[PDB]
Amino acid sequence: LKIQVHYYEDGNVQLVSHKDVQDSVTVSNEAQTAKEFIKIIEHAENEYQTAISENYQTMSDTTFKALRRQLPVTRTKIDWNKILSYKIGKEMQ
């Protein structure tokens, strides 16, 4: 189930994903495996779309925090006047 989504309003963003679904069932009958094939399909697709949405939900604090935090670990802004004015004590350990 490969997905490609592009968005470029005042920028550029591309979502590329796929889930290597793997499932099995014995071919019992035709109508049974037809709607059962749909059962596996509805399962994996509802699962996959929902999971993708929640991956978007947990992205401000996990993925981005792997790249760039929203706020530093001190949870405050930067006193540029402090860093430039004097060394924070980094020389001392």
């Binding site: 670990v73 001190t74 405050t76 980094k90």
Partner: peptide, 10 residues
């Protein structure tokens, strides 16, 4: 305290 920056919000 984190490396000298005393976290003022805690």
């Amino acid at each position: 305290i984190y490396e000298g920056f005393a976290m003022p919000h805690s």
